[PDB]
């Protein structure tokens, strides 16, 4: 078992590869990360391309549109409602003659089966909608009927009470020429454009929005980097295999330990080990495996069902790097000249975790105040929602000036509430602020307490 | 008395219901809270409905209105003054032909007795108002006269010196169809609209505003959730009763103690007990009772006089949850593995409270600086008012960049004041900031001091 | 001398008026403060009146004026320059027919001797200004000539190179009717209006501004509160006298002490006493005297030369209240149950003051970085100026997001500077932030150090 | 060697010039700094002149330009594209008749060789650009061709697919008259104006910008301050020489020490000395030398190749002052009554530096989260870029309200991401905030730890 203890001890190489593999993976893993950033950078530019395209589309297909008007862009009058739709209509008609871009649209029918449009002007309304507020009655069959008019590239009215929503659907193709700057072959994009005039609230206000989906592929006529990505993916598989192997060794050790604690004296009893870290030699590899598995997956099987899947997988990769980033420093610390910083973290959670819950508890009540208080005035608080948003306010500056004072002159109303709003909000800023440092501080003192001890398996060691 | 001591000790069940009741109430209480949130969520949507309606009304009845113009929307010329009024007038005339909503208005006369309008264009002016600034005199009978013109759904001038204010009052009814999305029967709303052109300042500037009151009821032709709310209300009564019972037990204990301290030796003397907490076993129940009493009340007797009363009662409920929230954790802590976090709070107040007053004292002077300084420049400081608002600035970021620098280039004026404004405001940021952490810190150290002891009835215990 | 020691000890009354006087003064002083706030509140409203008037005047006399355009309101073309001047001109002509206020203007000539205008359209230009950039020469006699055109209430061009500035001066009288709401007799205001088209920079940009001075007096035909103010002023004199008396007693004590330290043994040697506080028994009274002297002065002798003097004096009053506020708590503390909070402040300054200078020193270098760095990009840093403004940024949030990031995409220019701007600004945020808490903290620990001793004349005491 | 030890000890003068030199340099150095500020202030005004000129030029040559529109100023339609160019064109034609300034432009051809314009309307496009998105192909010869039209002071169309960019280049001369206010002779400026209509992204959006370069010289017909600057430069040389001398002495001491440690016993072994500071007696002088060398250089040899070089050199000067500022206080401290503040800094770095890396490590992972997360939503995060920008957010307020909440309602998209964005960003705010104070705190405690020891060569000293 002495060998096993030595293994647990693991510097060891110096006493003397496997580390290189582990070392390679961060570099291997680090490189894949590099590949992701490189993929990420390209995506961002192309992400950049998408952003540019979106701004343009909004400006191109939107009438009366203004920057920062997205929050409020809407129609308020039938005369108001019609003009944009006509305005939108105009763009489809006249695009080749006015746009600063070169777009081509053909076929591409949606979204119900068949046929061509390119874009279909659709109308959705209740199959039956007798609405008579004057006599406080209505009679409704809420089944939604969709009437769509087809427009082929080179004036329809729906009753306002009737409208549920109006959409305009069309597709435009364009070449991504910017690629030439990054020494790449221009891409072939197909933009699916959806303009929605939403009347689902039947509020007299109809917000209008334009959204786009982008399908990207190689042009009609045409590996290097792709091959490199494939090699990177293969390396990741090797790293995952190495992790599985290490995991197996750890499991054997556990069996020895499970056997060992029991085995020597028919020995009892099992120990949770509390934090028992350390922690990462095994936990980290699995996460890495998850990150590794994900990359292959994004590159592979559900990449044949693209968009959400690609993005989600990327999120997993991030955990590995910082974990990937994190592991290296700990490996990197090499005891970090005795690893003083590392020890500091562990003590706090035990006290902090208990501390966190009470704080959440103190917080939960604070959060509820928001639910009751909010409805009467302000938009910041209104749902769990903003109530989550406030939580930002107490910790940090940006909120405090704007609500606390903006609120006081107020929308107001209710003399008591104005009395009420100060009474509570004011209460709110203070309690956490004095406490929070202490929780960090008391822990921080505790860390100092961790430090005081700090400032200056066991049996096995003794035996050795 | 040993039994009494055991009762004080109260884990006890484990030594062994009542806890379940107490337990039920938080769940019962927690559920009512859930009901409130559910009520709160519905209200917010409906609160949402109200917000939408308000924005729409402003846009609908307002001419030249702009978003964020509420702060400044006003008339400056008689030509200016007339146009909106005409503009407002137009809306009443032409609403059925231009609005994206379906409104019906009938009868509903206000606000002096009689009759119909629907909306009355009223004029208020001084019975006698000879105003002659050219000769520095005036002769006034300030009794206000109200002339109202009635307009029945399908050009009047008042002297500018004369105007006190002009109002436009009218009611519109509409069905709340959005309810269908939340699977509810559409509601019947009556919006009371009041547009005010306020000349009370006789400043040459007439701010114009539009406000609405909403009366909500079931449509003309038509329990589940209501029944559930009733059941919840009944449960609350049971909880209140349980609290009264517990309170009675506590009182009996107090009599024993009042009797006991005196009784054994003709014993003296009474002890305040300082904080004596703990604290919540009795204090918490009463608050809960207040919250419980309030819910029934909002649901019940002064709910037959609706609006302010409903809102105020909700505020009371919040105290119970966080208190409701708070109690559970303490109950929940079950000593919290020795309840270390809980102890921490108590020591500080004793020192902190003393600390808070001095700070208020340091603060009171700081606040006064604001009253004298403010009038000359800036709008942020001007009344107790903003002076309260500044208090936000020192603690948190949002204020500091905007005033301190915006002020320095300044509206300015007075070479000394510009010298003056920096001299003091600059003084202001520093003193609290170094101190405040210490007050938390010194307390925090004190908490550490609380901690240092921390880091590691009496007679009765000894006897036991 | 024992009696003298007892006097130094001063609770004493309880051992047993003078305190009541001292007590009266804060109340007396507190009341005067109350009077000031009352004066301050009235002034603020009237301050409110002034603000309203200013906004109105700007809107009234300004063409193309927009809110928040004050920062940028200016003319850029001769066609541009003329229109406002004509526009301003129009207002004088047509005011009685378009304004929502009632203004009367007569006589009131300015600003050179004579005569009437009411407002004079003045032109200032260099007596001689041959300016020929094409041949890189000029010949100038910088003496300024002022040509003014007089306009009597019921098209002049100056060469652009020629212009130094153009002003429009006129006076308008109006009655302050709002006073009626606060149950006061309307006031008689005379507004002196000055519109300036400033070409002193000869930059091609001419900023245009409108400013007003307000002369306030009783109407032509017409004590209570004034009498009360007078009584308050008299009380203040009594308080000052009491302070002088106390000061004399302190001086006698000092003579005893000066005599006493020397006298007993031909005794040496004098002690500075370091902080020797305490501190306020004498320091506070003098400040109070300054505040007291100032109030009488504002009310009295240089109030016959009004405006700056009135405002400056008010500033002095503030010191007394907070000092007025401050003294009471210390008196109020009555040892504050042993006055623990009070002791805390003293230790820190001794270490903190030393700390403050080094910090200023660390800061001075930080500030210089601003002077060199700033000119190239951004407006925030540019002069001592903004450089003062930045100092706000490090401590508090509002600055950090806006410059640090806004700067990075940047106006930029200079590849190194973009490298440069991050390199230094980034350096800037960190150094103070870690340190500052420590300075408070290290002091705060020191306060704890103050606390550690804390947590738990001499000869005279011993003798006693 | 005793003398050498005494030298190391260096108060010494009091035991007793060289200090005066050192003293002179800060004053000498301080004065040069003063000169720089004076130079800096003049530059800023002139910097002010440049800013004014830029705003004016933008307004003057820009059509439809709006303040704060710089971020977005662009053309979207050929009809849109043409108008500004015509608009810009108009300004060159009509400037003498509309501008509020007096500009003269002659000769000054750019930027390819020859000849006159003054401004050349240039067009850059691909030598060959067959672009056919409809058939997903293109055929391109990316060599850029530049066609420029010359316009001599008293309608050309390029295919949109074709455009790479269009520029307008012209020069204007003007006299800087404002100088008269600062009692200086007006300067002769030549502004090189470049307007760019950038189509390099071929995105359908063409951003338009105007930039200026300023060449400044004395007018055609015409030392004091220049002589003074020269004297200052000479003084700096003397200071540098003094530093070299001191450095030589230090080197001799090092030889003695290098000889001494080895020499006495054939002695070993060399000590790094860790921080060994102190530190500045030698390090500071060299930096000063760099600052000193730079000033002469800016004034001298590469000043005959002006602009970037002048600015960069200034940056070096700043290090000396704060270093210049810093040294004096340490010299100034004169042990600072035992120099307690100075000691405090040293201990922390040893622990802090280790702490900083781990933090960077914790941070590096945090930063990566940004790269993956950002692309989907928001502009704040998008590149290393903003990811750097976020780092501002956690420490300070301005960021936290705006992203955290603005993000939550969101651009959004992806139900998981909305789940995702909160899950991580929320994670992000907390971890550093509790930790950071501790790192300062734990160090701060450590500083206290530094303090605890604090609160209360060797061999050579002993010998002495
Ligand atoms: C075209 O649309 C009509 C419905 O309007 C549908 O019946 C028909 O099948 C469609 N044909 C094609 C080719 O899409
Ligand atoms: C109406 O809009 C909603 C999104 O707000 C969408 O889910 C629904 O399918 C649309 N229905 C019609 C008929 O457009
Ligand atoms: C109608 O208004 C007049 C006052 O203008 C009032 O005298 C009369 O009683 C009112 N009648 C009704 C039915 O409101
Ligand atoms: C004038 O407006 C005020 C509110 O600012 C209101 O209280 C008062 O009743 C109104 N009077 C008239 C005649 O409108
Ligand atoms: C009127 O102005 C002229 C200068 O234009 C001056 O000479 C004359 O004395 C003034 N008279 C009065 C009464 O102001
Ligand atoms: C020009 O304006 C300045 C203030 O910027 C003022 O001091 C000066 O007296 C004015 N001179 C003339 C002739 O208007
Ligand atoms: C003028 O420009 C033409 C090109 O358009 C060039 O060939 C010629 O040399 C130039 N001459 C001068 C004096 O710039
Ligand atoms: C186009 O603009 C870029 C800067 O964005 C510049 O570097 C390049 O020289 C320009 N080329 C032409 C032909 O204008």
Short mmCIF file of C-alpha atoms in Angstrom, two decimals, chain B residues 46-249:
data_model
loop_
_atom_site.label_atom_id
_atom_site.label_comp_id
_atom_site.label_asym_id
_atom_site.label_seq_id
_atom_site.Cartn_x
_atom_site.Cartn_y
_atom_site.Cartn_z
CA UNK B 46 -53.06 43.67 -15.39
CA UNK B 47 -50.54 46.07 -13.96
CA UNK B 48 -49.05 45.49 -17.38
CA UNK B 49 -52.42 46.20 -18.90
CA UNK B 50 -52.64 49.44 -16.98
CA UNK B 51 -49.18 50.52 -18.08
CA UNK B 52 -49.97 49.83 -21.69
CA UNK B 53 -53.20 51.71 -21.36
CA UNK B 54 -51.45 54.69 -19.83
CA UNK B 55 -48.83 54.92 -22.53
CA UNK B 56 -51.55 54.66 -25.11
CA UNK B 57 -53.73 57.29 -23.50
CA UNK B 58 -50.87 59.71 -23.32
CA UNK B 59 -50.05 59.16 -26.95
CA UNK B 60 -53.72 59.11 -27.89
CA UNK B 61 -54.83 62.29 -26.11
CA UNK B 62 -51.52 64.16 -26.25
CA UNK B 63 -50.33 66.38 -29.08
CA UNK B 64 -46.62 66.86 -29.67
CA UNK B 65 -46.05 64.32 -26.92
CA UNK B 66 -42.67 62.60 -26.92
CA UNK B 67 -41.24 59.75 -24.88
CA UNK B 68 -39.25 61.05 -21.94
CA UNK B 69 -40.99 64.37 -22.56
CA UNK B 70 -43.20 63.78 -19.55
CA UNK B 71 -40.63 65.53 -17.43
CA UNK B 72 -40.97 68.57 -19.66
CA UNK B 73 -44.25 68.37 -21.56
CA UNK B 74 -45.75 71.88 -21.39
CA UNK B 75 -47.29 74.81 -23.29
CA UNK B 76 -45.50 78.17 -23.55
CA UNK B 77 -47.70 80.25 -25.82
CA UNK B 78 -51.41 80.93 -26.05
CA UNK B 79 -51.03 79.70 -29.59
CA UNK B 80 -49.15 76.88 -27.93
CA UNK B 81 -51.74 76.45 -25.20
CA UNK B 82 -54.73 76.26 -27.51
CA UNK B 83 -53.45 73.64 -29.92
CA UNK B 84 -53.23 70.75 -27.50
CA UNK B 85 -56.62 71.55 -26.05
CA UNK B 86 -58.01 71.53 -29.53
CA UNK B 87 -55.88 68.46 -30.12
CA UNK B 88 -57.28 66.80 -27.04
CA UNK B 89 -60.71 67.93 -28.11
CA UNK B 90 -60.26 66.26 -31.45
CA UNK B 91 -59.62 62.88 -29.88
CA UNK B 92 -62.93 62.80 -28.05
CA UNK B 93 -64.68 63.67 -31.31
CA UNK B 94 -62.92 61.19 -33.60
CA UNK B 95 -61.82 58.29 -31.36
CA UNK B 96 -63.97 55.53 -32.95
CA UNK B 97 -62.46 56.40 -36.33
CA UNK B 98 -58.76 56.53 -35.39
CA UNK B 99 -57.95 54.44 -32.32
CA UNK B 100 -56.47 50.94 -32.51
CA UNK B 101 -58.61 50.01 -29.55
CA UNK B 102 -62.34 49.68 -29.05
CA UNK B 103 -63.61 52.16 -26.49
CA UNK B 104 -67.15 52.95 -25.41
CA UNK B 105 -68.08 55.86 -23.12
CA UNK B 106 -71.56 56.70 -21.78
CA UNK B 107 -73.08 58.70 -18.91
CA UNK B 108 -70.44 58.84 -16.18
CA UNK B 109 -70.64 62.50 -15.16
CA UNK B 110 -68.08 64.20 -12.97
CA UNK B 111 -66.89 65.60 -10.80
CA UNK B 112 -69.14 68.28 -9.36
CA UNK B 113 -72.74 66.95 -9.16
CA UNK B 114 -74.21 66.18 -12.61
CA UNK B 115 -74.48 65.11 -15.30
CA UNK B 116 -73.05 63.78 -18.56
CA UNK B 117 -70.18 64.78 -20.84
CA UNK B 118 -68.77 62.34 -21.24
CA UNK B 119 -65.83 64.66 -20.51
CA UNK B 120 -66.19 68.22 -19.19
CA UNK B 121 -63.79 70.95 -20.31
CA UNK B 122 -63.36 72.92 -17.08
CA UNK B 123 -61.82 76.30 -16.33
CA UNK B 124 -60.73 77.47 -12.87
CA UNK B 125 -59.83 81.10 -12.19
CA UNK B 126 -59.86 83.67 -9.39
CA UNK B 127 -63.31 85.20 -8.85
CA UNK B 128 -61.48 88.53 -8.99
CA UNK B 129 -58.01 88.95 -10.42
CA UNK B 130 -56.87 92.47 -11.19
CA UNK B 131 -53.16 91.92 -11.89
CA UNK B 132 -51.07 94.91 -12.92
CA UNK B 133 -47.30 94.34 -12.67
CA UNK B 134 -46.61 97.54 -14.61
CA UNK B 135 -47.80 99.52 -11.53
CA UNK B 136 -46.73 96.89 -9.05
CA UNK B 137 -50.26 96.18 -7.92
CA UNK B 138 -52.93 93.68 -7.86
CA UNK B 139 -56.30 93.19 -6.34
CA UNK B 140 -57.45 89.73 -5.77
CA UNK B 141 -60.27 87.69 -4.58
CA UNK B 142 -58.74 84.25 -4.51
CA UNK B 143 -61.98 82.31 -4.40
CA UNK B 144 -61.78 79.87 -7.31
CA UNK B 145 -64.56 79.79 -9.86
CA UNK B 146 -65.04 76.72 -12.05
CA UNK B 147 -66.62 77.11 -15.50
CA UNK B 148 -67.14 73.80 -17.29
CA UNK B 149 -68.30 73.17 -20.83
CA UNK B 150 -70.09 69.91 -21.52
CA UNK B 151 -69.35 67.94 -24.67
CA UNK B 152 -71.55 65.03 -25.67
CA UNK B 153 -69.89 62.26 -27.66
CA UNK B 154 -71.33 61.96 -31.21
CA UNK B 155 -63.39 76.93 -29.07
CA UNK B 156 -63.33 78.50 -25.59
CA UNK B 157 -60.69 80.96 -24.39
CA UNK B 158 -59.66 81.92 -20.85
CA UNK B 159 -57.41 84.89 -20.08
CA UNK B 160 -53.83 83.82 -19.40
CA UNK B 161 -53.42 85.94 -16.31
CA UNK B 162 -56.80 84.51 -15.39
CA UNK B 163 -55.97 80.82 -15.68
CA UNK B 164 -55.46 78.75 -12.52
CA UNK B 165 -55.94 75.50 -14.36
CA UNK B 166 -57.86 73.87 -17.21
CA UNK B 167 -58.94 70.22 -16.99
CA UNK B 168 -60.49 67.78 -19.35
CA UNK B 169 -62.41 64.94 -17.83
CA UNK B 170 -63.90 61.92 -19.64
CA UNK B 171 -64.50 58.18 -19.21
CA UNK B 172 -63.88 55.34 -21.66
CA UNK B 173 -64.87 51.68 -21.30
CA UNK B 174 -63.05 48.75 -22.86
CA UNK B 175 -62.84 44.95 -22.54
CA UNK B 176 -59.58 43.43 -21.30
CA UNK B 177 -59.19 40.72 -23.97
CA UNK B 178 -55.59 39.83 -23.15
CA UNK B 179 -57.02 37.76 -20.28
CA UNK B 180 -57.72 34.97 -22.78
CA UNK B 181 -53.99 34.19 -22.95
CA UNK B 182 -53.92 33.45 -19.24
CA UNK B 183 -57.08 31.40 -19.76
CA UNK B 184 -59.29 33.92 -17.99
CA UNK B 185 -62.56 35.60 -18.84
CA UNK B 186 -62.04 39.11 -20.23
CA UNK B 187 -62.58 41.91 -17.70
CA UNK B 188 -64.61 45.10 -18.05
CA UNK B 189 -62.60 48.30 -17.53
CA UNK B 190 -63.75 51.89 -17.20
CA UNK B 191 -60.91 54.37 -17.54
CA UNK B 192 -61.40 57.79 -16.00
CA UNK B 193 -59.18 60.18 -17.94
CA UNK B 194 -58.03 63.53 -16.53
CA UNK B 195 -55.90 65.92 -18.57
CA UNK B 196 -54.57 68.90 -16.64
CA UNK B 197 -53.08 72.10 -18.03
CA UNK B 198 -51.66 73.45 -14.73
CA UNK B 199 -51.13 77.21 -14.36
CA UNK B 200 -51.00 77.32 -10.57
CA UNK B 201 -47.42 78.67 -10.67
CA UNK B 202 -48.39 81.52 -13.01
CA UNK B 203 -44.85 81.17 -14.37
CA UNK B 204 -45.45 81.45 -18.11
CA UNK B 205 -44.98 77.70 -18.31
CA UNK B 206 -47.99 75.39 -18.25
CA UNK B 207 -47.15 71.70 -17.71
CA UNK B 208 -49.69 69.34 -19.29
CA UNK B 209 -50.36 65.85 -17.94
CA UNK B 210 -52.76 62.98 -18.42
CA UNK B 211 -53.71 60.58 -15.67
CA UNK B 212 -56.06 57.65 -15.44
CA UNK B 213 -57.97 55.79 -12.77
CA UNK B 214 -59.21 52.31 -13.58
CA UNK B 215 -62.41 50.73 -12.30
CA UNK B 216 -62.45 46.98 -12.93
CA UNK B 217 -65.42 44.62 -12.79
CA UNK B 218 -66.94 41.52 -14.41
CA UNK B 219 -68.69 42.02 -17.73
CA UNK B 220 -72.50 42.19 -17.81
CA UNK B 221 -73.17 38.51 -18.51
CA UNK B 222 -71.42 35.58 -16.82
CA UNK B 223 -65.64 30.93 -8.12
CA UNK B 224 -62.81 28.36 -8.15
CA UNK B 225 -59.87 30.67 -7.55
CA UNK B 226 -62.00 33.00 -5.44
CA UNK B 227 -63.03 30.02 -3.34
CA UNK B 228 -59.38 29.04 -3.01
CA UNK B 229 -58.50 32.55 -1.90
CA UNK B 230 -61.26 32.28 0.69
CA UNK B 231 -59.86 28.98 1.92
CA UNK B 232 -56.44 30.58 2.15
CA UNK B 233 -57.92 33.43 4.15
CA UNK B 234 -59.54 30.97 6.53
CA UNK B 235 -56.24 29.15 6.99
CA UNK B 236 -54.67 32.46 7.90
CA UNK B 237 -57.27 32.94 10.60
CA UNK B 238 -56.34 29.55 12.02
CA UNK B 239 -52.68 30.54 12.03
CA UNK B 240 -53.52 33.77 13.83
CA UNK B 241 -55.44 31.76 16.40
CA UNK B 242 -52.48 29.46 16.87
CA UNK B 243 -50.30 32.53 17.37
CA UNK B 244 -52.69 33.92 19.96
CA UNK B 245 -52.55 30.59 21.76
CA UNK B 246 -48.77 30.56 21.69
CA UNK B 247 -48.82 34.15 22.87
CA UNK B 248 -51.03 33.15 25.78
CA UNK B 249 -48.56 30.43 26.74
#
